[PDB]
Amino acid sequence: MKTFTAKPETVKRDWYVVDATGKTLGRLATELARRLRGKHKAEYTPHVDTGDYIIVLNADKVAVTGNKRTDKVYYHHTGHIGGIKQATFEEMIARRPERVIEIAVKGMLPKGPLGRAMFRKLKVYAGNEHNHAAQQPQVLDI
Amino acid sequence: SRVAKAPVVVPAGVDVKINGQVITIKGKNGELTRTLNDAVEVKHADNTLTFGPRDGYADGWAQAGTARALLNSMVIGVTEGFTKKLQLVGVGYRAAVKGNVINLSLGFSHPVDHQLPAGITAECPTQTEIVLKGADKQVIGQVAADLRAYRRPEPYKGKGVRYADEVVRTKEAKKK
Amino acid sequence: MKVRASVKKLCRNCKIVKRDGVIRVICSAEPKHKQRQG
Amino acid sequence: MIGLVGKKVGMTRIFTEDGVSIPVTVIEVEANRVTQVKDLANDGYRAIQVTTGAKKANRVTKPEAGHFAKAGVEAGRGLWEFRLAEGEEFTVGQSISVELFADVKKVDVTGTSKGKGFAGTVKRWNFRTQDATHGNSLSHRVPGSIGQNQTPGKVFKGKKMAGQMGNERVTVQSLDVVRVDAERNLLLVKGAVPGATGSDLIVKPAVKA
RNA sequence: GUGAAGAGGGAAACAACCCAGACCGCCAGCUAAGGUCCCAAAGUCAUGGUUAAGUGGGAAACGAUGUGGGAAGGCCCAGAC
RNA sequence: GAUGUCGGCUCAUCACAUCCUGGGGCUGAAGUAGGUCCCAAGGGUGAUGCUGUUCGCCAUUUAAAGUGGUACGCGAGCUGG
RNA sequence: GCUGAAAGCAUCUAAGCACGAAACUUGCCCCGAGAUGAGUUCUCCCUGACCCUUUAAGGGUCCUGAAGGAACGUUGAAGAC
């Protein structure tokens, strides 16, 4: 016999909704990533995406400990010689509430085409209203 | 701590209102309120307030002492308020109050007009005097500091806006 | 303001205070006793 | 506030009685016809879409023709949008004329500059030419060095080089309004504006003032 | 001693460091150095402390009421600070 | 079994131990001026006589004529004193 | 700087409340949904059959070809092409 492998055309994916208010950023992000990758399923197979669709609400209310709210810096480079640009956690929340959770989860996911496909299943929202009522998400507590 | 041990005496005519952490004081001078820190136990008693630390909070005594001081200032606030006296020193330095605005002539090329906050009223006995009245100690101190900052007392003649009870300690340039 | 690695009291009126993680000497009698450790 | 769409007619002078010559650009501003009003509820922002001039009925496609017919206006030579401030409102089919600028006295004129084609670095970026003599070998107008050495190992992005010059949208700010002539559909602004004669110009009240 | 003339695991990568020398095959198990939130396998482990700087996760003489302890002192309820 | 040297030229980019402009404390800071230290890279920071010269010294400017890194930046860009 | 304990006092800091520079982020200008995360509004146009099977988001046949676009030509203060 050969070890069972998941088939991309027959995997079962479910929808969940998560409220991010008050949650620690990293401790929420790890759980989000492990469910996006599908590591909670008995059918987990490294080369196929078996994770679920997760909806995150109230991304602007996510919490961090210590002085991270003013001291965590987000660097990126534009590609030009001046280039280096930075933003603190507070600035990111004021401008992009969703971006912080998105990039934390992205940093916790495998790199490569499959990892990007996995990240595609994450729907992050600043408010507590989403447009995906038709997919009937289940309430998931993290 | 041992500042916080001494309870504050609630006199007649003033009442207290507590919702766990946010507190309210009402008296003849008016309305004062704040939210105390999460580590201090506000506890009204027979016409007194007693303050103590909570549990699981390090440095709860320091916060208790701060809360005791603030509430003491509130009680002294809603009754007879607070007063700050400012003096103007220097030739041509004048002050005048126009309703809710203080007009200062401090030797600039432009007029200086200061807008008072909600609870503060000003009154100029002379042009070299500014008397401030209000219930909030912090606000009146802030307003006095803001007025002082326009022309700080320089150390060669003491010219500028000073608190009435202030020492300037002038000095001479080199000699002669 | 004196910026030094070694800040000390210089007279009886000078006092050590730590403001925002910085050791400072503030002195009520002599203005040139002000010091910050940097 | 909104602006209007005109066309660059040419450039002349105005003589003032006190013996001053003012170089002016003559901008013909016909009636601008509002063809669509965009609002926050439907389009997510507030703006009006205007048309001006005329177009040959054979050159207007039934998509464009139907869009014009909905507004009930005649076909123009194009469509432009102006972002609306909080105060003003307009209605579809309304026509706006040049006396909008009756009391403005500074405008911002936007147009497409004249196309210079593929231009060298001396013309495009004001690079200095090298020696004309003294042994110079085939290198009188070339750019010279373009990078450092192994340590960068590459040419930095955004380096100034030869390429297309002109034929791009350019705005000139804070132009004096010299005359508004409603009956002639003329606006006269002090100075030069981008673009060749007969090209479209967008005139707006000065944003910086 | 190791490389030379040695593989493999670890050390982010990294002849010569650590554990440990590869007869061949197995979709068997068990361990060493290193690990057990996630990338990336396995503790979001139990119990007590200790640090708040991101120490951890780069630096000295030299400074400082930053805190967790210990052993000794002086003063003092007539009354210390 | 080849990594062209110096200077100039054309073109640069970055660091901050900031020359100028900006903020501030101390003065043995009256003002005019400064001195010294702290913060701060947004922009700007001479063209000439001699010398192959970098430099230097001049003679006049300027708001100021910064200092270093970049194969002492740059010869499949140029010159070659 | 203000109020303010620890550490009867004090103390810009610990709770809390203010300020403050050509830096920063905007505001001025340009590009920009391959922004694969490819978005938005208005408008225009096509609503005939038949057959064969593996049956599937299947393939042909005949009639039909619309909105539009291209080609070609007269050309351009557009442009190497």
Side-chain angles (χ1 to χ4, degrees):
Chain A
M1 61 79 71
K2 293 182 183 293
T3 291
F4 165 82
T5 187
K7 310 294 199 53
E9 69 275 16
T10 56
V11 294
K12 182 67 181 294
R13 292 180 179 91
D14 302 357
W15 282 78
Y16 302 78
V17 65
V18 176
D19 174 5
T21 187
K23 302 302 181 43
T24 297
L25 182 62
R27 284 161 200 281
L28 170 53
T30 61
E31 179 56 41
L32 283 188
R34 71 177 298 261
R35 292 181 183 271
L36 279 174
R37 207 201 182 161
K39 292 177 71 68
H40 65 279
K41 316 262 199 83
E43 293 82 3
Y44 162 75
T45 297
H47 73 267
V48 55
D49 182 353
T50 61
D52 307 290
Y53 298 86
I54 307 310
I55 281 160
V56 194
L57 297 182
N58 308 321
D60 46 336
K61 294 181 176 67
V62 65
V64 286
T65 58
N67 288 347
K68 288 183 199 133
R69 179 153 299 251
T70 61
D71 305 1
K72 183 175 174 66
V73 187
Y74 283 101
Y75 307 91
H76 68 252
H77 199 300
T78 62
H80 292 240
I81 187 56
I84 192 66
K85 293 182 183 293
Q86 65 182 357
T88 44
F89 190 99
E90 262 170 2
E91 292 158 314
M92 296 282 285
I93 301 299
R95 185 180 67 189
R96 311 256 174 91
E98 320 80 350
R99 180 72 275 172
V100 298
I101 285 184
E102 286 176 5
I103 62 171
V105 185
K106 183 178 184 293
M108 293 180 183
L109 284 170
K111 317 286 181 303
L114 183 55
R116 305 201 280 290
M118 293 180 183
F119 172 91
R120 256 193 280 290
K121 297 183 290 294
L122 178 77
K123 316 286 163 143
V124 180
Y125 290 106
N128 64 7
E129 307 304 346
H130 69 89
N131 290 318
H132 314 285
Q135 287 69 60
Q136 313 124 307
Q138 295 298 109
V139 176
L140 178 70
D141 190 0
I142 301 299
Chain B
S1 179
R2 66 182 294 275
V3 175
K5 298 291 180 68
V8 72
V9 176
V10 188
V14 65
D15 63 358
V16 298
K17 180 67 174 66
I18 297 89
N19 285 3
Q21 285 306 129
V22 65
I23 190 167
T24 300
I25 301 299
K26 180 67 174 66
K28 66 182 290 294
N29 284 259
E31 182 65 26
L32 285 187
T33 187
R34 58 161 56 260
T35 309
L36 294 174
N37 203 22
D38 265 356
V40 65
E41 182 65 26
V42 67
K43 186 180 289 293
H44 182 74
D46 54 341
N47 76 4
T48 57
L49 294 174
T50 61
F51 292 162
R54 298 297 182 81
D55 291 331
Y57 289 122
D59 279 283
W61 282 116
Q63 306 273 339
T66 300
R68 186 267 183 275
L70 309 187
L71 277 296
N72 189 359
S73 296
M74 302 213 195
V75 176
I76 297 169
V78 291
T79 61
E80 69 273 15
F82 301 92
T83 61
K84 267 270 172 173
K85 293 182 183 293
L86 277 296
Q87 279 180 39
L88 282 72
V89 176
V91 65
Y93 287 23
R94 292 183 291 113
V97 65
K98 182 67 181 294
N100 190 359
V101 160
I102 308 196
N103 285 278
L104 306 166
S105 49
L106 307 153
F108 293 144
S109 296
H110 65 99
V112 176
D113 301 352
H114 191 73
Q115 183 66 41
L116 282 72
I120 301 299
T121 73
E123 190 276 331
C124 293
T126 71
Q127 51 201 31
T128 65
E129 254 101 63
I130 311 175
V131 168
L132 298 175
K133 293 182 183 293
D136 198 311
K137 197 174 199 213
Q138 188 274 331
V139 176
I140 190 167
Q142 180 75 105
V143 159
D146 281 354
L147 280 188
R148 183 178 182 270
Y150 281 125
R151 178 67 66 192
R152 293 181 184 271
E154 61 86 20
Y156 290 99
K157 292 181 181 180
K159 295 174 64 173
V161 164
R162 50 169 92 191
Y163 301 129
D165 52 345
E166 190 170 350
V167 176
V168 285
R169 295 179 66 250
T170 73
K171 65 182 181 180
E172 182 65 26
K174 279 73 176 175
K175 64 183 181 293
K176 296 183 290 294
Chain C
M1 185 63 75
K2 294 182 183 293
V3 185
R4 292 180 181 177
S6 178
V7 298
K8 309 174 298 213
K9 274 158 181 153
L10 294 174
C11 65
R12 292 183 291 113
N13 288 308
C14 295
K15 293 182 183 293
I16 307 279
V17 59
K18 176 167 199 233
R19 298 185 164 150
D20 195 336
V22 176
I23 301 299
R24 291 161 164 300
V25 182
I26 62 170
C27 199
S28 61
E30 182 65 26
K32 65 179 73 174
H33 285 170
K34 290 174 70 175
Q35 312 176 66
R36 64 153 307 161
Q37 184 178 2
Chain D
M1 182 179 72
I2 63 170
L4 309 171
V5 185
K7 66 182 290 294
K8 185 176 180 180
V9 171
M11 186 179 288
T12 187
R13 43 152 64 101
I14 305 285
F15 274 114
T16 75
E17 61 86 20
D18 66 316
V20 165
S21 179
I22 297 169
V24 310
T25 304
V26 176
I27 297 150
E28 166 188 65
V29 186
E30 307 199 23
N32 287 233
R33 292 188 296 272
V34 159
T35 62
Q36 201 189 342
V37 171
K38 293 182 183 293
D39 62 25
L40 183 63
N42 186 7
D43 295 280
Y45 64 94
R46 305 193 47 231
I48 54 173
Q49 197 199 36
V50 306
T51 204
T52 192
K55 185 183 286 185
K56 291 174 71 175
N58 297 115
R59 291 289 190 180
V60 54
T61 62
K62 294 159 307 173
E64 295 167 335
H67 179 68
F68 276 145
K70 197 206 190 203
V73 311
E74 294 293 328
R77 57 169 200 271
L79 300 155
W80 299 255
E81 268 185 50
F82 291 98
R83 291 289 281 270
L84 263 57
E86 294 294 328
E88 69 275 16
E89 293 83 3
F90 296 89
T91 61
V92 54
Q94 195 186 354
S95 66
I96 306 140
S97 66
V98 55
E99 49 271 51
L100 183 63
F101 296 108
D103 291 331
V104 169
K105 66 178 72 66
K106 297 291 180 68
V107 286
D108 279 355
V109 174
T110 284
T112 295
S113 43
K114 295 159 100 143
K116 300 294 187 291
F118 193 108
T121 61
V122 163
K123 183 191 199 33
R124 186 185 191 191
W125 294 114
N126 306 329
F127 277 10
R128 263 177 299 260
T129 66
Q130 294 201 72
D131 270 343
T133 73
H134 289 299
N136 193 286
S137 296
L138 295 175
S139 296
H140 310 289
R141 291 177 73 100
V142 289
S145 185
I146 60 165
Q148 280 78 21
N149 210 300
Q150 183 177 177
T151 300
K154 47 159 190 183
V155 176
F156 282 132
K157 186 182 287 185
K159 183 63 163 63
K160 292 181 181 179
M161 293 180 141
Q164 171 69 24
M165 173 180 201
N167 194 242
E168 64 173 14
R169 183 179 64 83
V170 172
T171 300
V172 176
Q173 294 207 306
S174 307
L175 289 195
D176 282 2
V177 190
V178 176
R179 183 177 293 171
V180 194
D181 185 319
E183 69 275 16
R184 293 180 181 177
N185 299 334
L186 296 190
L187 173 85
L188 282 71
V189 303
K190 190 198 163 183
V193 298
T197 294
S199 63
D200 300 328
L201 286 184
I202 291 166
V203 181
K204 274 182 280 193
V207 69
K208 302 222 298 203

